[PDB]
């Protein structure tokens, strides 16, 4: 069998959205506070993440159905899922060869130790890299990569969400698209969909661990002052 | 006549404090978000000012008497006077030759138009440069420059101050030091002290105009998100 028009244009507008919000040249990185190698890397990685939050909002605004949600639910989904979308999108720059994120040149090549200099520990970073390796080993299509991020964005089991029926519905329609894509357009993808859903579960525990270490970071004023207003707002505990 | 020991060590510890918190090489500027020439210069000048706020706190902590004040009064004085201390200290990089602030190289040479690209207007910038020219034309000693900043810091007519008697006392003792310094150690300074006190009045109206344009800036989220936590806190209206 084959995909329907509606599933097709969902794929189209999603792939187009990722292209509009992800720069493979990483040319905007020179605009960040430069990297330094206590917590020397925090200003750069804070600028990097803040920039990424903005891009995630752009992507989300183009996910079919997201714009129709209430502003509250839009925020609640964005706040809870952000760091996971960041982790998901960051796979595009991750290299299996040197176990790092390569983003333009040697200044913007980020190894595990760089994130250590941002206030984070191996309790987050080793399952992080573990996650990145497994995800990269799936060799996802651009359609599958973009669907997965949209699946994750529209997860109904987030703190703060209200219309858990409408959000579960959008996510289910998105999941239908993915199942269908793998079956029809991905040879030897007999098991891929299951592996991808599992990757969402991994993100949840990655999210939790980051939220713990960030909460540590944000409670110390000498460190929280190195963050950005956007980062503080999105990862902050205000309702 | 001559200066007393106590007036002398007030001068000494003040000059030492300015040296510890002002870098004539401006080498930390490469750590800021780079300058760009809507509101392209805002990230750099926000990083610049935030950095400067930190340096002003360092200076203030070494002003004899400031540390003994309550934390509340310390904040209240710091919040209200900050931008004036910034304007005062920035005279060291101001050049009469090109009417600009030269801070290391051509990237960090700031003309009036650069600040325009930070969300500010000529209603602030032309009395600003007007102020800088007059101050530079005084050709202050390092002792007079450092005393003036400490005079300004300990002004008792600020919003929020409580112990206006103790703060007026410290400022008066500082003023005594200045009057004495000019008389004894500054030839042809017959009128300088009066001119300097007038420069404090100019700062008040400069402060007011900046506070208006900043309030405009801070109310727009797309602009306030480009500021720093420290800037937002110090120039913000919270009590």
């Amino acid at each position: 069998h084959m995909l329907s028009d509606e599933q097709m244009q969902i794929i189209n507008s999603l792939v187009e959205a990722h292209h509009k919000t992800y720069d493979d040249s990483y040319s905007d990185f020179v605009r960040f506070r430069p990297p330094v190698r206590r917590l020397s890397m925090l200003p750069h990685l804070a600028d990097l993440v803040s920039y990424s939050i903005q891009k995630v909002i752009g992507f989300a605004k183009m996910i079919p159905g997201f714009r129709d949600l209430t502003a509250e639910d839009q925020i609640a989904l964005l706040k809870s899922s952000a760091i996971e979308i960041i982790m998901l999108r960051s796979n595009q720059s991750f290299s299996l060869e040197d176990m790092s994120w390569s983003c333009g040149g040697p200044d913007f090549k980020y190894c595990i130790n760089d994130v250590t200099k941002a206030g984070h520990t191996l309790e987050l970073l080793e399952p992080l890299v573990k996650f990145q390796v497994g995800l990269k080993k799936l060799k996802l299509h651009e359609e599958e990569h973009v669907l997965l991020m949209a699946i994750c964005l529209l997860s109904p089991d987030r703190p703060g969400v209200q219309d858990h029926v409408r959000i579960e519905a959008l996510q289910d329609r998105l999941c239908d698209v993915l199942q269908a894509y793998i079956r029809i357009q991905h040879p030897g993808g007999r098991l891929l969909y299951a592996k991808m859903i599992q990757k969402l579960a991994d993100l949840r525990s990655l999210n939790e661990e980051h939220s713990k270490q960030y909460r540590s970071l944000s409670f110390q004023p000498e460190h929280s002052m190195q963050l950005t207003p956007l980062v503080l707002e999105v990862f902050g505990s205000e309702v | 006549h001559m200066l007393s020991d106590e007036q002398m060590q007030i001068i000494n510890s003040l000059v030492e404090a300015h040296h510890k918190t002002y870098d004539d090489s401006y080498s930390d500027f490469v750590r800021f978000r780079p300058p760009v020439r809507r509101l392209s210069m805002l990230p750099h000048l926000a990083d610049l000012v935030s950095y400067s706020i930190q340096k002003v706190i360092g200076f203030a902590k070494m002003i004899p008497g400031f540390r003994d004040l309550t934390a509340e009064d310390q904040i209240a004085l710091l919040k209200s006077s900050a931008i004036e201390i910034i304007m005062l200290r920035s005279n060291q990089s101001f050049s009469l030759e090109d009417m600009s602030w030269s801070c290391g190289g051509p990237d960090f040479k700031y003309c009036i138009n650069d600040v325009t690209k930070a969300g500010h207007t000529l209603e602030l910038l032309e009395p600003l440069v007007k102020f800088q020219v007059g101050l530079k034309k005084l050709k202050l000693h390092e002792e007079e420059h450092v005393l003036l900043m400490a005079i300004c810091l300990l002004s008792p007519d600020r919003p929020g101050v409580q112990d206006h008697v103790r703060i007026e006392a410290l400022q008066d003792r500082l003023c005594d030091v200045l009057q004495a310094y000019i008389r004894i150690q500054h030839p042809g300074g017959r009128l300088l002290y009066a001119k300097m006190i007038q420069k404090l009045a100019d700062l008040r109206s400069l402060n007011e105009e900046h506070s208006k344009q900043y309030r405009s800036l801070s109310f727009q989220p797309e602009h306030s998100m480009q500021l720093t936590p420290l800037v937002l806190e110090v120039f913000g209206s919270e009590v």
Partner: peptide
């Protein structure tokens, strides 16, 4: 959430 609200138009 002033920033987020603005960014979401």
């Amino acid at each position: 959430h002033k920033i987020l609200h603005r960014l979401l138009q």
